[PDB]
Amino acid sequence: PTTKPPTARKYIWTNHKFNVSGTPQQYVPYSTTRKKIQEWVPPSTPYK
Amino acid sequence: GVRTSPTGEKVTHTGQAYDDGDYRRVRFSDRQKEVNENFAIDLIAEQPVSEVGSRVISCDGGGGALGHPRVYINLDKETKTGTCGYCGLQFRQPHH
Amino acid sequence: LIAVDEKLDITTLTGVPEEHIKTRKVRIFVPARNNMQSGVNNTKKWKMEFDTRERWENPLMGWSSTADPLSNLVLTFSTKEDAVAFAEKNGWSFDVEERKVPKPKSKSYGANFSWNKRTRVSTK
Amino acid sequence: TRPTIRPRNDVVHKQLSAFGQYVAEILPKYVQQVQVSCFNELEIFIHPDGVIPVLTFLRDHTNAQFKSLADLTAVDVPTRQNRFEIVYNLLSLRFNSRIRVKTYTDELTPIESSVTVYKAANWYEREIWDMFGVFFANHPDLRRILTDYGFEGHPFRKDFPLSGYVELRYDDEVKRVVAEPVELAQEFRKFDLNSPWEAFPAYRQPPE
Amino acid sequence: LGLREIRIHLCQRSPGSQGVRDFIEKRYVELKKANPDLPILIRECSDVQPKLWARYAFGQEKNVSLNNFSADQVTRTLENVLSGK
Amino acid sequence: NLIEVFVDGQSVMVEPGTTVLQACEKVGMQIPRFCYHERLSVAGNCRMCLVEIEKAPKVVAACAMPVMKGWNILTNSEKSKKAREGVMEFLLANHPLDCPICDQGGECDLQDQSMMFGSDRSRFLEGKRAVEDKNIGPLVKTIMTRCIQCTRCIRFASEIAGVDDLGTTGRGNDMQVGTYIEKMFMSELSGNIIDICPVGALTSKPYAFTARPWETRKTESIDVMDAVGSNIVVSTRTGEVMRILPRMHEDINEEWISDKTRFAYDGLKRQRLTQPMIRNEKGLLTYTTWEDALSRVAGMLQSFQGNDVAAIAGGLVDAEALVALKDLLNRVDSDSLCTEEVFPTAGAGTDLRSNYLLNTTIAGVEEADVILLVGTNPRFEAPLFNARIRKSWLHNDLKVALIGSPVDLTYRYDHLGDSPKILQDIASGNHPFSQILKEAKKPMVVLGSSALQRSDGTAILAAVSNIAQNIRLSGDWKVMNILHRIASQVAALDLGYKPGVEAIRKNPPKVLFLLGADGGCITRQDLPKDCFIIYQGHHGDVGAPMADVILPGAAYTEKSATYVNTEGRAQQTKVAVTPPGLAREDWKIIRALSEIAGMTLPYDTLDQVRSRLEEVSPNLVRYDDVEGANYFQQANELSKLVNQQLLADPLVPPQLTIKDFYMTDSISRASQTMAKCVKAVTEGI
Amino acid sequence: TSVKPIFSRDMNEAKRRVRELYRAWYREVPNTVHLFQLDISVKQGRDKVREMFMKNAHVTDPRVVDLLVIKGKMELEETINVWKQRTHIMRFFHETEAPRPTDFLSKFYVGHDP
Numbered sequence A: 001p002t003t004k005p006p007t008a009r010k011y012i013w014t015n016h017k018f019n020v021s022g023t024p025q026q027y028v029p030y031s032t033t034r035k036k037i038q039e040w041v042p043p044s045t046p047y048k
Numbered sequence B: 001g002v003r004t005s006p007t008g009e010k011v012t013h014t015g016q017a018y019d020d021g022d023y024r025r026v027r028f029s030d031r032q033k034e035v036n037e038n039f040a041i042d043l044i045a046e047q048p049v050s051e052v053g054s055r056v057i058s059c060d061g062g063g064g065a066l067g068h069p070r071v072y073i074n075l076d077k078e079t080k081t082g083t084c085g086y087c088g089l090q091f092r093q094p095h096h
Numbered sequence C: 001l002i003a004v005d006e007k008l009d010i011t012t013l014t015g016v017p018e019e020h021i022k023t024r025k026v027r028i029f030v031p032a033r034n035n036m037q038s039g040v041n042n043t044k045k046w047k048m049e050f051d052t053r054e055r056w057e058n059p060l061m062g063w064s065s066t067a068d069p070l071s072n073l074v075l076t077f078s079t080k081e082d083a084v085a086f087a088e089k090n091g092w093s094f095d096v097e098e099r100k101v102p103k104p105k106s107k108s109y110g111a112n113f114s115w116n117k118r119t120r121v122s123t124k
Numbered sequence D: 001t002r003p004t005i006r007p008r009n010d011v012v013h014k015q016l017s018a019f020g021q022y023v024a025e026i027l028p029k030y031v032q033q034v035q036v037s038c039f040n041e042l043e044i045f046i047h048p049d050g051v052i053p054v055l056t057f058l059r060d061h062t063n064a065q066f067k068s069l070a071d072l073t074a075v076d077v078p079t080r081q082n083r084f085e086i087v088y089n090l091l092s093l094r095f096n097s098r099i100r101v102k103t104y105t106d107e108l109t110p111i112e113s114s115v116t117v118y119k120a121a122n123w124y125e126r127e128i129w130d131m132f133g134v135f136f137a138n139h140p141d142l143r144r145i146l147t148d149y150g151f152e153g154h155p156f157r158k159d160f161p162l163s164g165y166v167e168l169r170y171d172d173e174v175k176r177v178v179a180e181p182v183e184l185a186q187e188f189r190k191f192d193l194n195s196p197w198e199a200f201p202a203y204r205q206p207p208e
Numbered sequence E: 001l002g003l004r005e006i007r008i009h010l011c012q013r014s015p016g017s018q019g020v021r022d023f024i025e026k027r028y029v030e031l032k033k034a035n036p037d038l039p040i041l042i043r044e045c046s047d048v049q050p051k052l053w054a055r056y057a058f059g060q061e062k063n064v065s066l067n068n069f070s071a072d073q074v075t076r077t078l079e080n081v082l083s084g085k
Numbered sequence F: 001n002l003i004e005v006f007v008d009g010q011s012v013m014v015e016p017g018t019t020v021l022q023a024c025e026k027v028g029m030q031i032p033r034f035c036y037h038e039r040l041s042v043a044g045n046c047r048m049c050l051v052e053i054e055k056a057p058k059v060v061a062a063c064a065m066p067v068m069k070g071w072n073i074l075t076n077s078e079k080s081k082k083a084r085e086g087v088m089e090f091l092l093a094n095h096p097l098d099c100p101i102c103d104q105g106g107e108c109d110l111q112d113q114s115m116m117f118g119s120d121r122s123r124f125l126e127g128k129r130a131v132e133d134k135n136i137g138p139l140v141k142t143i144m145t146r147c148i149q150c151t152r153c154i155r156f157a158s159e160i161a162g163v164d165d166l167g168t169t170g171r172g173n174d175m176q177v178g179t180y181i182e183k184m185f186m187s188e189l190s191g192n193i194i195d196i197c198p199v200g201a202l203t204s205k206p207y208a209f210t211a212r213p214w215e216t217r218k219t220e221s222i223d224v225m226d227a228v229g230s231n232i233v234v235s236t237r238t239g240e241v242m243r244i245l246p247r248m249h250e251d252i253n254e255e256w257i258s259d260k261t262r263f264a265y266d267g268l269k270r271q272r273l274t275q276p277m278i279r280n281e282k283g284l285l286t287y288t289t290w291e292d293a294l295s296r297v298a299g300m301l302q303s304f305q306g307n308d309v310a311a312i313a314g315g316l317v318d319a320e321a322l323v324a325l326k327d328l329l330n331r332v333d334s335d336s337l338c339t340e341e342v343f344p345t346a347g348a349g350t351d352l353r354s355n356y357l358l359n360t361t362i363a364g365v366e367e368a369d370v371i372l373l374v375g376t377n378p379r380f381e382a383p384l385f386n387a388r389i390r391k392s393w394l395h396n397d398l399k400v401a402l403i404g405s406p407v408d409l410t411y412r413y414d415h416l417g418d419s420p421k422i423l424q425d426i427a428s429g430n431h432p433f434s435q436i437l438k439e440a441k442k443p444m445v446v447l448g449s450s451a452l453q454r455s456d457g458t459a460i461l462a463a464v465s466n467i468a469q470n471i472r473l474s475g476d477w478k479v480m481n482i483l484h485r486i487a488s489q490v491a492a493l494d495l496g497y498k499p500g501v502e503a504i505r506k507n508p509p510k511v512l513f514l515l516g517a518d519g520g521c522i523t524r525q526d527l528p529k530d531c532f533i534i535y536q537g538h539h540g541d542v543g544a545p546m547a548d549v550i551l552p553g554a555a556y557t558e559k560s561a562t563y564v565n566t567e568g569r570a571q572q573t574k575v576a577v578t579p580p581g582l583a584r585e586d587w588k589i590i591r592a593l594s595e596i597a598g599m600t601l602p603y604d605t606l607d608q609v610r611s612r613l614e615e616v617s618p619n620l621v622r623y624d625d626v627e628g629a630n631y632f633q634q635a636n637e638l639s640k641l642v643n644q645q646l647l648a649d650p651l652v653p654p655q656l657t658i659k660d661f662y663m664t665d666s667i668s669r670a671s672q673t674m675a676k677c678v679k680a681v682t683e684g685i
Numbered sequence G: 001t002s003v004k005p006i007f008s009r010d011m012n013e014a015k016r017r018v019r020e021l022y023r024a025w026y027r028e029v030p031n032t033v034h035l036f037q038l039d040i041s042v043k044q045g046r047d048k049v050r051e052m053f054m055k056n057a058h059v060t061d062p063r064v065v066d067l068l069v070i071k072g073k074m075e076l077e078e079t080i081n082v083w084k085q086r087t088h089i090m091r092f093f094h095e096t097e098a099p100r101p102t103d104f105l106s107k108f109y110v111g112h113d114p
């Protein structure tokens, strides 16, 4: 890399990280999409 | 554009954030939520608008075979700018 | 060469659970032509498919979970008679839908230029 | 020359056609049909009850020394009345040739075991029975070979689900592995891939 | 005992329903005028025998077969149902 | 008579005037095509259907070439293959490289025909053209760089929709399809230009980028948004409804669906009822359990019996639910069963199906010589029926007359006044249209059911029946017709529900079951104080806010059910997805309620419920059958007993504009695409 | 109408084979219990064999009965030779599966399944 430096990008990490398994920084999966069906909220005013 | 939800949870670029009553936030306790800080929409908005003197302009994403398939964009409608929809790049024809 | 008049019941031999044998209604139909395309090569063979069951979301990763083994099971038959015979010998309930062929139509290019009819077109 | 098109061997095609006519003439009682594919493969369609005579002839005849049993399998076609299609692939080292024999059979019709003619037929027919349900009458030892013990159903039939009906996991309450109804975290995604346009006019069927 | 609804199921192209068809043709109009508020619904079967369903109070129903009946027999059967006997 | 032609040496007998393409269809060969559509006029410009005749030196366009006697058609000839390759080469030479970012990707006729009858290589070394995209409304997204100038949208627009706003502006390679001006192509049949476009030039804007064809699963069902009963295919991915497509049915659909049917599927994902809800001590609605809600309803049902029990059926209710509720209310000797739409009960009423069915089938319009529309706007009440009327007009020179308000139909018609006085005058014979009807060989009288909502519906029905009787006085052809706009109306009438809600008004009930009743016909002001309301439904619009106990149910995409359309044909909707949350099937809810109340209904499965349906009415279980008996003589004899005077009020249809078309029912109101359409048609662009 | 037999020409021979198979299974239950160290009793094994035999009592075609007894003999052969484990023998006894209710009200409460 000293002879042939890698191409610099604004999104490339400046600080490298090792395997963080078994640590509080470990990756935890989750759903990245929103809710599919919206429920009907009842009115807040009593009818009688 | 990482924004924090009312529950103190970071919102991803897809508008994802567990609600207050959602039990699924327990998986992040004693751990962390993986969120990518760089937002492609914000970056592409930050990118400027190229101006060329032609009605039709070709975009291949840069790099030739390392980009996207070459497309041709018609720069006639002066109301907006012609956007290459592979790379999301805006091109415009000079007006003033 | 023994003689028998049974209806060829292999329900006890297939190994399927009695729930999926007795509580399933299959549909024997010719698949409809996809309107987004003009090809008619997918509307030539009869299809046997089962009824749709529940599909919920995985708590993790939000994937589409299921509990119906026969959800992806689709069989291809050459004729309605063969499909019905297979369904009867396997013991599932079934409903058969008749084939809907497109009826022949009268088309004339000269009708677009008519002296006194309304079929005359205003553009080409 | 055409670099992208496979060459054709008319000499081998004619030889296979002649041998098919020869065997059909020799065995008119069982041979129902003879075919030669365009890639020079001979196929003999016979009655299911002539399996032993046809195989014995094709093994012991002086001009038909097919001493080696290359393969033995079945194909399930639900639309046919006789869904199961037993296929025998025979190899003749004396003449450096291969032949294919086809037989039809339904669920309840037994077939004569070919263990007397070929010894590989033992395990091949055991596998066929285990995977399809086809029964072979005179087999020295017919039982499941590949599936788990106590497995219900024949997986290779076209009406059997891909994921089966039961799955295994360890249950701590009973301190053993248990079998429970299958329940996938992510359902297998069936893809409709067939194009609505006919690709090969040569295989076009009559409109019926 | 209190009659609530009458249903007449008659196939429109079967020989056994010919008598029931003739009742509808020239006798139904007179019956409906005498019972303006009675739901006398007429439907069409496919291959089964013609039937007369009589729904009483509290969801109680009785079915009477009308196969090969003549026009007069259907009239008598309906009169018995209407009068309660 | 029939002439003899040859396709690849095989003889086939075809009618005179048959084209080469249709002869190939007869023999089983599908000639490639881009501009040819069997339901549109012939264009002959794409040139993809060029085939070779055995001895002719020049290829002919199969889509526009009538066959001659003794012709041999070489479909798989070398000249035909080379011509197809050349045409595909031109099309792909000017086409853009947008396949991955295109909604037409896996279902494109350009890609499939390129892979079948095209070359695998390109020798085009020049630069491609680019065309500025147009804007024709919020429903259709236009990327005109992908257009192949096949003129399907122009021909469809003109002939089917009667809207001559699309056309080709320019000349040569610069020819562009568009509206020239920024007018939006808005119609009740505007998604069919999305369907018929072979390329991704016209694509569904709501469906844009959501999925791919190979992922989706197709469920064949029927449309429930009106009384046409259009056949549809629901494309669902991972248990979520992705889109709705037309399904061919040459007696109802004829390959088209309305825009409300196509684009209201997104209303099933909003304002949904998922859990049972009950009133708490504060008068607010709170979630509860099925056992609790059914126990409350069963206690009320046990407490109250007799005429103090009413059921109001809405517009999206199925035959199974209707018959289950009818049996449940009959078990307590109650009979205040009604549907939220009014039909005249005088005379025969609902005792004869011909009295309220569309006796002349939808396919039977093409045979009629004269049609008289009374008090209806078929363009928005039944868009497919109006399309059939326009097709009959265009082809057979059908004469259409409309009595009442001059709505903007897609064809020229004879306007007759606005009041029922002219309707009564035609029966007497003073009007010239009486002579027109008498001289017409095939007349039809289509009375809109929306004209029966007013207080003089019985007189209107009597007048039109008198007109039909006068027509008949002057074989096997049926004149009298009634056009419905509610899917559950015909099924309720067949089952025996009382039309209207006048019975409930005259005998106010103590227990009211609103089964999908979102029309607002009956409210608590009309109902007695402390009336107990159970609203069973899938969307919370009116009945759910006004209800005491809310029971979540399944939609038509979520339940397997039976619906009867305006012509009496019964069709079964299949399950595409499952009800969300704790929502359950309607007949199962009714059966569970009966079991808890101690009045167990004698059916536990859908087959048993349909056996009960067969017992009540066999036509409800005879699927896809429209044949029936015509008791018009008896109906007219019973109708002419009581006499009512027509009001002087003009016959104004409820729907006079496309916004009124867009907003009609609960699913449409819950949709956001329909709101976008309404905003577009009102505000503009 | 006319088909070739497998083992039995008519139903009497099939019933005889069924009785022989039942005898063979009945005489092997205590040995199976002892060898696999099952926690069940011999009476439970006999009752389970009876239940398995009684769930195919509606079969009337002799060929189907012949195939069923062939499969039963195969399963007995696997058990006698101790080819199977305790796992499969206990798989015969559905023990970790929750009791699925068979009443309409409970089926309605639990979910959408018929």
Ligand SMILES: *P(=O)(O)OCC(C)(C)[C@H](O)C(=O)NCCC(=O)NCCSC(=O)CCCCCCCCCCCCC
Residues within 6 Å of the ligand: G014, G015, G018, G021, G025, G029, G032, G045, G046, G048, G049, G052, G053, G056, G057, G058, G059, G060, G065, G068, G069, G071, G072, G075, G089, G092
């Ligand atoms: P009589 O002849 O009336 O006898 C009554 C029956 C009903 C049996 C009749 O014989 C009859 O007509 N039966 C109908 C046809 C028939 O015989 N069916 C029986 C099929 S054979 C069969 O199913 C045997 C296979 C069962 C194998 C059981 C496996 C043992 C499990 C043990 C698990 C635990 C053990 C430790």
Ligand code: SF4
Residues within 6 Å of the ligand: F095, F096, F097, F098, F099, F102, F103, F104, F105, F106, F108, F109, F110, F111, F146, F198, F199, F200, F201
């Ligand atoms: S219209 Fe067809 S060929 Fe054109 S970009 Fe879309 S998928 Fe590709």
Ligand code: SF4
Residues within 6 Å of the ligand: F146, F147, F148, F149, F150, F151, F152, F153, F154, F177, F196, F197, F198, F199, F201, F202
């Ligand atoms: S927009 Fe589509 S339908 Fe219209 S001419 Fe172009 S390719 Fe044809």
Ligand code: FES
Residues within 6 Å of the ligand: F032, F033, F034, F035, F036, F043, F044, F045, F046, F047, F048, F049, F050, F061, F062, F063, F064
């Ligand atoms: S299909 Fe004939 S020229 Fe287009």
Ligand SMILES: [Mg+2]
Residues within 6 Å of the ligand: F104, F194, F195, F196, F197, F198, F199, F200, F201, F202, F203
């Ligand atoms: Mg398109």
Ligand SMILES: [Zn+2]
Residues within 6 Å of the ligand: B059, B060, B061, B062, B068, B084, B085, B086, B087, B088, B089
């Ligand atoms: Zn680009």
